[PDB]
Amino acid sequence: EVQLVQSGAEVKKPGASVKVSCKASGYKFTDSEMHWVRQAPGQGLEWIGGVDPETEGAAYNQKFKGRATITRDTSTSTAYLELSSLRSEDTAVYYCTRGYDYDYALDYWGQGTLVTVSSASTKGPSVFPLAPSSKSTSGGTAALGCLVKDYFPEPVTVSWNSGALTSGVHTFPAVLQSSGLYSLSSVVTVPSSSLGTQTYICNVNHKPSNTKVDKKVEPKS
Amino acid sequence: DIQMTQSPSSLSASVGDRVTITCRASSSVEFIHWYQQKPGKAPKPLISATSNLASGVPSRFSGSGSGTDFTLTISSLQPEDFATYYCQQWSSAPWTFGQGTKVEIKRTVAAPSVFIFPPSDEQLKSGTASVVCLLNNFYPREAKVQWKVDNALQSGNSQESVTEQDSKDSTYSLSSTLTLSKADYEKHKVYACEVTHQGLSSPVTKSFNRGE
Amino acid sequence: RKLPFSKREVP
Structure with a gap:
């Protein structure tokens, strides 16, 4: 069974950075791409970028170029998205999703990670x-x-x-x-x-x- | 970038109705993919390459189109089809998605089942009283909740929220919370939640007496 | 099987 397990929700101050993980299982990690898609209040879905593990690089949407860093650890089958210089507009649910085949839709998605960008103090309920x-x-x-x-x-x-x-x-x-x-x-x-x-x-x-x-x-x- | 525009942005239809969602690309694309997203969940693949149903997708879904004009059709809308639908292209970089289409379900009127909850003793110890009024499984969405304290109509001390439409019975539920300090709560006896809804012949009041 | 972005072939 294919599973994409993301790291927990986070609060970060404006200007700080966030690094989200996506642990994959149930398939050959190095033979598929991992993509990052965010869902912000303002829009529907936006592609951030992605990575093919057999390339040593990453692809970015021009909007996130220079602000996002997408990495991967082939040994733990984990993909990471780091977003820097965080702004209010970055408050969003970030999803990792598998790029399996060009003719097929992004077939498996992580549960999402809500990142909140705020100067306000965290408070437990x-x-x-x-x-x-x-x-x-x-x-x-x-x-x-x-x-x-x-x-x-x-x-x-x-x-x-x-x-x-x-x-x-x-x-x-x-x-x-x-x-x-x-x-x-x-x-x-x-x-x-x-x-x-x-x-x-x-x-x-x-x-x-x-x-x-x-x-x-x-x-x- | 290739802009993906869906129409309409939202639609409502009954169970068994035939529903259509169009996706227009600002420039020609080889094909599009469709995703379905249920509330609080990740998107799921629905259609691959304009017309191929994703794994486990029922036959009532179909996709057609070419170049710049595409259509998702739901031949017999089911309660579980309540979701936001997205088209997507990756023929050109950056990959882009449509803005989404919310599909809502019209069904018969259902009156809410009303429940009231006094504040817990633990909360009272902390110096606050939250009184919760629950309206369960009703349709349509429009419902009026009025808080009454010793029969005096309350204003400015409550907050409410409604759930997304239920995936099985297409109803909504609503929670309304009246918040007062422990001192203000201890000054009054009767706490009433009064509900007005299309499914109720007359308003339904759920009440309790403080310390009973 | 052609990977969506990279277009890398995987048999």
Whole structure:
């Protein structure tokens, strides 16, 4: 199975540089190209550049020439994108993607790495339960969740029960609070009949502040 | 550079409708590739070299065109086709993409299921009270949430966000958070979330009494 | 198989 695993989200100050990694597996790394594509709020997708490991060089889109450095370590099957002199316009999700054949679309993509360019201080979130109770029931179903409050920058990821619970989950887009900090909620609807036997834990991850929080959400007593 | 322009930038259609997305290149290209991107996910290959379905792509997708004019057709739109579609060329350097086309799904009206969450005791210890109101699985998107504290209509102390359209049932969900200091929260008894929606014959209120 | 950018042939 082909996998492209990227490094975690980062916050960087304007003028600083960022280096993103893309660890490849499931194919012959030296026999394919690795490309970098970004998705910025302002545009859709933009090709940054790429590398064919059997060339000792890299290709760049003229827009990024002199500011981006694309490298590769054939021994660890890892491709890297370094972007320097970071500006506000560089806040974007950066994807690595495999260039397999000229007649075929970029067939495998990394999960993306959000890079935020800001002078503001990183802040880890506070995680609070959204407890199921008589106020969060609907025709035999109970809603419950986690409130992930006051973090910076984005993203926060939320899983339920280490990813074993996915059905009925809604992790909401973050809201920007007046303080400049973000907040989000992640909810799930489950049978109200099994609230005393099942365990619901939200796994909260905020890579920029290295925060990992597991919160068990119990019915309110 | 070869500029890729898609039309329309967004469209909405019902399940079973036939949908078209055009891609125009500012200069002739050998072919284009199409990608499909679901929200919060990486793009996935959809069509290779104008008309060849990528691996695992259902038969309802087709691609046609040549030179500067290309079309993606979805013969029977399905709920899981909610995504942004992108065309791309690499016949000329730099490789360029279209701006994307958001495809949204029209479906029948569905009333929200409304839930209310008082602040946790842990949050209260920290000096703040966030009261969360959840509107689950409704259609259309337009929904009105009003916060009422001891029956007084609130303004300027809440924030809301809506999810992307669900990939299976094409509904939205909405979260609304009322934030007050622990002192302001402790001054009042009744906390009510009042919901107005096309699917509700009259507004639905979910409420609780502080410390109950 | 021709690599997209480099056009390198890989059998």
